[PDB]
Amino acid sequence: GPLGSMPNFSGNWKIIRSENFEELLKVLGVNVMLDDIAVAAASKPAVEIKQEGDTFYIKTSTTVRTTEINFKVGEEFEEQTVDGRPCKSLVKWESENKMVCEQKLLKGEGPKTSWTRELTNDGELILTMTADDVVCTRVYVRE
Binding site for all-trans-retinoate, residues?
138-140
Reference 91, options 70, 67, 112, 66; nearest CA is: 70
Would you list which residues are annotated within the binding site?
A: 138-140
Query: E strands, the chain, where?
Result: 11-19, 47-52, 55-61, 66-72, 77-80, 86-93, 98-105, 113-119, 125-131, 134-142
Give the phi and the psi of residue 18 in degrees, each rounded to 5: -140, 145
Alpha-carbon distance 56 to 44, whole Å? 21
Reference 57, options 9, 124, 5; nearest CA is: 9
Alpha-carbon distance 72 to 33, whole Å? 18
